[PDB]
């Protein structure tokens, strides 16, 4: 928490019609040395939310533990499916964690993104957290894409890219993103963002992990971009 040594890189989290599509490369670099090239930086902290990550890796695995145990604290005191913690709650809670530390001078260098489905209109009232058809349309207003800078700066949009894509993939998104995209439309748009990052961003690589938060759950897959 004195300085970042094992740092992640940019993540991108847009929302398409079936749910969120948050993507991130899988490299953590020990400065200028690609020490780890299979690290995962998109964790599931609920059956309906994920949590992005950028900056130093030592603090995700910190902030992962904080949420993942708050989640079970919810999961113990849940009687109805509407008692779950909406992704808004976490992003308003993570914002507190970053802000309260800014009162001190230990910020836990990060650019956490909180993304998930902020609604309960789709039955998942049986939580198999320990061990785990068609998508449903989502009103694009029930999807919450948070963001928290290491100064506490927080907000939500339709698409939040953090780390270093904020200069590269943000320009593509700001002029090619339209509401209610589709499955293959989002992936090719993101693949046209990361392919831009992989070319111009030194601290980023291939071997993308793409996570989609749909009406049925959180799904994973590991593409490998073709230049």
């Amino acid at each position: 928490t004195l300085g970042p040594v094992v740092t992640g890189t940019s993540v991108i989290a847009i929302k398409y019609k079936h749910g969120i599509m948050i993507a991130a490369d899988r490299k953590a670099s020990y400065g200028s040395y690609a020490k780890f090239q299979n690290v995962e930086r998109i964790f599931k902290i609920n059956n309906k939310t994920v949590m992005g990550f950028s900056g130093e890796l030592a603090d995700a695995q910190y902030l992962h533990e904080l949420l993942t145990r708050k989640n079970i604290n919810n999961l113990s005191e849940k009687k109805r499916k509407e008692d779950m913690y909406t992704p808004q709650h976490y992003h308003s809670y993570v914002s507190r964690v970053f802000y309260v530390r800014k009162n001190r001078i230990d910020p836990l260098f990060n650019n956490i993104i909180i993304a998930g489905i902020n609604s309960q209109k789709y039955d998942n009232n049986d939580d198999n957290v320990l061990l785990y058809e068609e998508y449903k349309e989502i009103h694009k207003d029930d999807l919450y894409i948070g963001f928290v800078d290491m100064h506490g700066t927080n907000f939500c949009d339709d698409y939040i890219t953090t780390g270093y894509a904020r200069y590269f993939a943000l320009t593509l998104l700001r002029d090619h993103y339209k509401d209610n995209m589709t499955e293959e439309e989002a992936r090719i748009l993101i693949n046209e963002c990361l392919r831009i990052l992989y070319f111009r961003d030194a601290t980023s690589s291939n071997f993308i992990q793409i996570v989609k938060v749909t009406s049925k759950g959180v799904e994973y897959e590991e593409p490998y971009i073709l230049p």
Partner: protein, 213 residues
């Protein structure tokens, strides 16, 4: 290296008042040093039915000061069953800011509302508990560009005192002029602005679109 914990996200909060109303206008850009986080982050919050607060500091402190202030007002409502006058909210914010004097919020505030029949009153602060009731004020990156303008169209140090009469219909057009004149010339002043008008019946959130450059 030392992790300086203050940043200026920019934005400006124009304030203006009269015998019947107060006009509060703030942009919505929320920007880091040179990049832009978002095109719409409301810098203006309402506290009572007739009292709104606008801030132009660092967005973490802006939020955590408005959320904290509402906590101390809904608390006031529960214990006293009647909403606090603006004067009450005025001093209450002075203490909250000054309570953290030695690590101050980086949040310049303008507090606007009505207390008497209308008697439109408007306080402005500087990040440490120092409020002076004023006729017109603005805080933020564009503060240094707008206060000159408003001092030549509210207080008349002109030879012949014209426009001595001010009507809500025209003062909005003054504010829309100020918030737009600063928009070209200032860097951080936003792209979409929200104008709040507090008249005797309620608050109006009519909007205006500015330059995006």
């Amino acid at each position: 290296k030392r992790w300086y914990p203050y940043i200026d996200n920019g934005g400006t909060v124009i304030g203006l008042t009269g015998k019947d109303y107060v006009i509060l206008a703030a942009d919505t850009r929320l920007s880091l040093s040179y990049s832009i986080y978002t095109r719409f982050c409301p810098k203006i919050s309402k506290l009572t039915d007739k009292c709104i607060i606008g801030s132009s500091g660092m967005q973490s402190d802006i939020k955590t000061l408005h959320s904290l202030l509402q906590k101390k007002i809904q608390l006031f409502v529960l214990e006293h069953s009647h909403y606090p006058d603006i004067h009450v909210i005025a001093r209450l914010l002075c203490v909250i800011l000054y309570s953290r004097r030695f690590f101050p919020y980086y949040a310049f505030n303008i507090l606007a509302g009505v207390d008497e029949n209308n008697k439109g009153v408007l306080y402005n602060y500087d990040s440490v508990g120092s409020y002076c009731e004023a006729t017109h004020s603005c805080v933020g990156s564009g503060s240094q560009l707008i206060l000159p303008i408003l001092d030549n169209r509210v207080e008349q140090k002109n030879q012949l005192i014209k426009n001595t009469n001010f009507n809500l219909g025209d003062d909005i057009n003054f504010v829309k002029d100020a918030i737009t004149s600063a928009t070209e010339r200032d860097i951080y002043t936003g792209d979409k602005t929200l104008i709040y008008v507090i008249d005797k019946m309620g608050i109006n959130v009519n909007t205006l679109d500015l330059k995006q450059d």
